DNA sequence: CTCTTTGAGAAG
DNA sequence: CTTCTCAAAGAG
């Protein structure tokens, strides 16, 4: 049993765009995607990114409040 | 396990 | 400082 570390901005949003890209193209391989997705995400703005942010800190507060001695 | 991304958080 | 691991994804 573990309790996993929170996404990080970059892979809240990527886990949408990465599903967005597979559901047309199956059997492009997720090594290839994460470049693509890489590229991507250093291209937007920071109102772009600013939900995933807003949203990969909720996640990280929460999770140390629930696991207020996480080994990393 | 790897392969790849960013980014957190820890280590050296 | 750098440098390492893991979160997600799922096919080799």
């Known amino acids: 049993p573990h309790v996993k570390r929170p ?27 994460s470049k693509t997705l890489g590229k991507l995400w250093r291209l937007l703005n ?14 990280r507060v929460q999770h140390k409040k629930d696991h207020p001695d996480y080994k990393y």
């Open 46 to 59: 920071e109102s772009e990114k600013r939900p995933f942010v807003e949203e990969a800190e909720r996640l």
């Open 7 to 33: 996404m990080n901005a970059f892979m809240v949003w990527a886990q949408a765009a990465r599903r967005k890209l597979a559901d047309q193209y199956p059997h492009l391989h997720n090594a290839e995607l």
